[PDB]
Each structure stands twice: as structure tokens, then as C-alpha cells.
Write a protein that binds this ligand. Structure first.
Ligand SMILES: Nc1ncnc2c1ncn2[C@@H]1O[C@H](COP(=O)(O)CP(=O)(O)OP(=O)(O)O)[C@@H](O)[C@H]1O
Ligand SMILES: Nc1nc2[nH]c(SCC(=O)c3ccccc3)nc2c(=O)[nH]1
Ligand SMILES: [Ca+2]
Ligand SMILES: [Ca+2]
Ligand SMILES: [Cl-]
Ligand SMILES: [Cl-]
Ligand SMILES: [Cl-]
Ligand SMILES: [Cl-]
Length: 159
């Protein structure tokens, strides 16, 4: 069994409802169990800013699925909650499920890059992760606590 960490974001169609629904759906993924859920945070948008604030959270999920099988299931949940690909890059969405980490595995396949390529630069990922896994060490040996102690990130406000 491997512990995966998933980032959850939503800024459309009642984010609290979307995130609660996503948590129920995550609990229904085969060969998997939710270990921990962070608080929910109301975060200003990074990238394009002409969109609503996000609800961001993190979840720890224990699984015996292959990493790409986990991805299959997270994509299914996004699609079933009305996620649609649009023209604009990094636009608003009903639900975004990013696989941040899959144990200490390092993956670059066509569908899947883990660790998430930009998570070490995103407070809305790192703070909820720290809440649920304060002792976390990345596959490259970097400590989550050290990143947050060293780098400027705004603290998050609760949803
Ligand atoms: N760690 C990961 N978690 C989820 N999807 C991933 C991933 N690594 C690669 N992907 C791929 O990313 C593709 C596009 O996903 P999108 O959700 O549109 C990018 P985004 O989340 O809006 O931006 P971001 O990656 O900068 O956070 C998916 O079809 C999936 O195959
Ligand atoms: N508060 C917030 N902003 C986001 N922005 C995106 S997509 C773009 C993005 O994260 C980025 C970060 C740095 C530079 C350019 C784009 N997802 C989220 C999210 O879940 N939360
Ligand atoms: Ca994302
Ligand atoms: Ca995504
Ligand atoms: Cl809401
Ligand atoms: Cl959407
Ligand atoms: Cl940030
Ligand atoms: Cl790493």
C-alpha cells in the first residue's frame, strides 16, 4: 500500500458542494481508503485572476492501485462532476484533482507527472499538505517543513 496525496480545487458551481461530493467519490475508489482530509481554504486565484476564489484542500489516500489507475479514477470523478476542457488555460472549473505525490515514486509518463511539477511553488497546495502531513519528505529528499520555513507563501484563510 502506498500513500498518495491529492490536491483538490474548485471555484465553480458551489465549491463546497463540489468538494464534499469529490470526497465521497474518492472514498469509493477501489483498493483505496482516505486517511486524512485537510481543512478547506478560500484562496485567491494564481495564474489568471479574473475568476472566483478557489476552495482548496488536500487528501491523503492509501491505495494499492497503480499510479495511472488512480489517475483514471480521479479523472472519472472530475468528468462526472461536470469538468469540461475549455479554450482558456488555467480557467475556472467545477473540480480539479491533481495527484501531488504517489509515495516516493517519480513518474513521467504521457498522462502523469509526479510529483506535481509546480507544487513546491504553490501555497494552496503546500499549506493543506502540511496540515495533514507535517513530516513529509519529497522523493528528492526535500522537507516540506523546510520549504515552508524558507519560501514566501501567504498563509491561507479558512473557507
Ligand atoms: N500529477 C497529475 N495529476 C493529475 N493530472 C495530471 C498529473 N500529471 C499530468 N496530468 C495530466 O494533466 C492533464 C491536463 O490536466 P489539467 O487539469 O487541464 C491541468 P491543470 O490542473 O489546470 O494545471 P496544473 O497542472 O498547472 O495544475 C490531464 O489530462 C492529465 O493526464
Ligand atoms: N488559488 C488557486 N489558484 C489556482 N490556479 C490554478 S491553475 C494556475 C496556477 O496554479 C499557476 C500558478 C503559478 C503560475 C501560473 C499558474 N489552480 C488553482 C487553485 O487550485 N487554487
Ligand atoms: Ca491544477
Ligand atoms: Ca488538473
Ligand atoms: Cl459553495
Ligand atoms: Cl468545469
Ligand atoms: Cl503561492
Ligand atoms: Cl521531489
Amino acid at each position: 500500500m502506498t500513500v498518495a496525496y491529492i490536491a483538490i480545487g474548485s471555484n465553480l458551481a458551489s465549491p463546497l458542494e463540489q468538494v464534499n461530493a469529490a470526497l465521497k467519490a474518492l472514498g469509493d475508489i477501489p483498493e483505496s481508503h482516505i486517511l486524512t482530509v485537510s481543512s478547506f481554504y478560500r484562496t485567491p486565484p494564481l495564474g489568471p485572476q479574473d475568476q472566483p476564489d478557489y476552495l482548496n484542500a488536500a487528501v491523503a489516500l492509501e491505495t494499492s492501485l497503480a499510479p495511472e489507475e488512480l489517475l483514471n479514477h480521479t479523472q472519472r470523478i472530475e468528468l462526472q462532476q461536470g469538468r469540461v476542457r475549455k479554450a482558456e488555460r488555467w480557467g475556472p472549473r467545477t473540480l480539479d484533482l491533481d495527484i501531488m505525490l504517489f509515495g516516493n515514486e517519480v513518474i513521467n509518463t504521457e498522462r502523469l507527472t509526479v510529483p506535481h511539477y509546480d507544487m513546491k511553488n504553490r501555497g494552496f497546495m503546500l499549506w493543506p499538505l502540511f496540515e495533514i502531513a507535517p513530516e513529509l519528505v519529497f522523493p528528492d529528499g526535500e522537507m516540506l517543513r523546510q520549504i515552508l520555513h524558507t519560501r514566501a507563501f501567504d498563509k491561507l484563510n479558512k473557507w
